[PDB]
């Protein structure tokens, strides 16, 4: 019986380990579901924000057309008043110089009948032209006013659309905060959080490796620009390279506090190789500077550049945000050379 205790104890430990593994698997599955939900929420917020910006731009475009229509309407009103005065005086002159035949008002004695007839015909022709022009301008003004009113009605629809988008964005933001809070509470276990961090870090390496093997940038690299790279964003550094993030996991990049929607500028010219959403880092933009030198910008709320697009130094590539489950807005800056992460502080200018 003494020898059989060890095997029985292992089964009990294995059952507890299996139960713990099953609980960990259920917790991991719940975390994966929470991560999937957060990714949908984060992507939805960016899509909603882009729609809001588009609608705002459309409204701005309408505004200028509204001003042009108002100026045209003012000019048309001035022309209408002038032509109305002209037509009124011409009609009064005709009322004065009727010259009706049936009342014996014809053939004034000792006058140039041909010349007076020519005067009358010219006056009538001028009246006809004036009334035709007045009708034309009035019709054009009425059509423009009808179109201008329709444009205002269309703006109303745009405003309605923008209001609905704003409400959805607010609801999405609240849900994302709740999703983040649930993940953080469930990540209270030190062991669970460390394993998740390793998988995200492992996931980043695979994506970086695939991108590196796809686009072989012919650039000269950023080696010659050591210590002179402009700061991608203006803000206070929250976490330095090599700082202990959690347990035995140390940050591989520089975390700089940034305001929501803050513009993020590329440190050096390069070609974008990865502009997708990555678990644990939010929106990540990968720029390849050639010779194996690449720069990564994560946690961006929205990405403006797409994969394969060329970016110049100082150009806005993405907007800083809290993507990737961050509790506050920030921008994650990482510099990688030969697939090895280097301290950003040694590259950025002091």
């Amino acid at each position: 019986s003494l020898f059989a205790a060890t095997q029985q104890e292992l089964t009990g430990v294995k059952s507890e380990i299996s139960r713990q593994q099953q609980s960990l698997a259920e917790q991991q599955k719940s975390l994966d579901q929470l991560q999937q939900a957060l990714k949908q929420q984060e992507l939805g917020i960016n899509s909603i924000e882009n729609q809001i910006t588009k609608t705002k731009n459309d409204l701005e475009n309408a505004n200028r057309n509204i001003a042009q229509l108002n100026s045209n309407i003012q000019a048309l009103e001035t022309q209408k008043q002038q032509q109305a005065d002209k037509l009124e005086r011409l009609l009064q002159t005709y009322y004065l110089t009727k010259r009706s035949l049936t009342n014996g008002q014809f053939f004034h004695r000792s006058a140039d009948e041909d010349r007076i007839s020519q005067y009358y015909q010219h006056l009538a022709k001028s009246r006809a032209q004036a009334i035709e022009a007045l009708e034309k301008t009035q019709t054009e003004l009425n059509s423009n006013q009808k179109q201008r009113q329709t444009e205002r009605e269309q703006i109303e629809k745009l405003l309605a659309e923008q209001t609905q988008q704003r409400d959805k964005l607010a609801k999405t933001q609240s849900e994302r905060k709740q999703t983040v809070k649930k993940i953080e509470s469930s990540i209270s276990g030190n062991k669970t959080y460390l394993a998740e961090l390793q998988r995200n870090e492992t996931r980043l390496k695979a994506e970086i490796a695939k991108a590196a093997k796809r686009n072989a940038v012919l650039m000269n690299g950023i080696a010659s620009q050591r210590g002179k790279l402009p700061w991608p964003l203006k803000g206070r550094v929250l976490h330095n390279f090599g700082e202990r993030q959690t347990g035995q996991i140390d940050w591989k990049g520089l975390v700089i506090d940034a305001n929501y929607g803050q513009e993020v500028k590329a440190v050096y010219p390069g070609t974008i190789v990865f502009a997708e959403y990555l678990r644990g880092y939010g929106l990540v933009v990968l720029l390849d500077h050639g010779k194996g030198d690449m720069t990564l910008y994560g946690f961006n709320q929205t990405l403006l550049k797409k994969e394969g697009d060329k970016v110049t130094t100082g150009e806005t590539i993405a907007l800083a945000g809290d993507t990737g489950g961050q509790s506050r807005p920030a921008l994650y800056f990482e510099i990688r050379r030969n697939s090895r992460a280097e301290n950003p502080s040694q590259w950025l200018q002091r």
């Binding site: 037509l87 009064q92 110089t97 014809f106 009358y120 009334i131």
Partner: protein
């Protein structure tokens, strides 16, 4: 032995007489055309006479003088000015035309309905008409000068008052119309009689045979009466159609003439009453001519 109804025999005779005209096409057609033309010409002459008479009656106004007030003049000011003018001596009467009444008068003319509507507020000057007590031209000129200097008007208009010339022209037209109408009526009356005489002479044998039998005179006479009546009716209808086709052209010509000036004029055609009188005159003339000629020629025919 049964006899047809009084109306039936007359209707049958009328139908037979109408059918008879097809026997000799050329002569009947020519006489009908001449009758139509000779009845149309007096109609046109009378139409011109009536138009001239209407114009002369219209021009009968005693050289009425028109006064135009300023467009912006207040209505109470216009009323006060009208009262003062009425009080002033040498003015027979004063008539005030409101701006909207003048607007309606102007809108009566063609081509002005659209402009008035398009204008937000059409505002014609208040037109006032003053009839001088004395028709003398010197008095008219003096009164016009005084009204212009009255310091309450913007313009003054005066009429032509050419009554005598139009009266003389009307008298001349009346004489010409009477003479030509009389000549044409006599010509058409006499033309019918000759054709009836020739027709009676054509069928001498049948008339002799009928009179040899105990035929009455009225029976022999009726067909010629109805032929004359048909001649008259057809001639009058053709004359009315020709008169209409002539008045359309005359109206077109007068409209073209008046178009040279900005005003327009329209001719007053013969009324519904005139056409009925024309038909009655044609029928009466034809029937009387046929009766007299046929009877006179018929008395001189013996059965053997």
């Amino acid at each position: 032995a049964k006899t047809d109804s009084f109306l039936a025999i007359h209707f049958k005779q009328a139908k037979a007489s109408f059918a008879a005209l097809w026997r000799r096409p050329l002569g009947n057609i020519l006489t009908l055309a001449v009758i139509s033309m000779a009845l149309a010409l007096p109609a046109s002459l009378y139409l011109l006479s009536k138009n001239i008479a209407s114009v002369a009656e219209r021009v009968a106004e005693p050289s009425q003088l028109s006064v135009y007030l300023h467009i912006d003049t207040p209505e109470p000011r216009i009323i006060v000015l009208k009262d003062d003018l009425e009080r002033r001596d040498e003015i027979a009467k004063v008539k005030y035309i409101s701006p909207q009444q003048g607007l309606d008068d102007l809108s009566q003319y063609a081509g002005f309905e659209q402009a008035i509507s398009l204008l937000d507020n059409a505002t014609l000057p208040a037109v006032l008409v003053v009839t001088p007590k004395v028709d003398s031209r010197e008095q008219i000129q003096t009164l016009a000068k005084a009204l212009q200097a009255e310091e309450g008007v913007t313009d003054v208009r005066m009429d032509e008052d050419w009554f005598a010339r139009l009266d003389a022209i009307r008298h001349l037209a009346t004489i010409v119309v009477i003479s030509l109408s009389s000549l044409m009526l006599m010509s058409v009356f006499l033309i019918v009689g000759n054709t009836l005489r020739f027709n009676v002479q054509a069928n001498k044998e049948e008339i002799q045979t009928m009179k040899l039998i105990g035929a009455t005179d009225a029976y022999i006479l009726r067909p010629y009466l109805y032929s004359g009546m048909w001649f008259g009716l057809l001639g009058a209808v053709a004359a009315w159609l020709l008169t209409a086709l002539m008045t359309i052209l005359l109206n077109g010509a007068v409209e073209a003439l008046a178009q040279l000036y900005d005003s327009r004029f329209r001719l007053i055609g013969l009324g519904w009453d005139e056409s009925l009188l024309l038909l009655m005159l044609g029928v009466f003339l034809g029937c009387v001519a046929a009766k007299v000629s046929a009877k006179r020629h018929l008395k001189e025919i013996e059965p053997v």
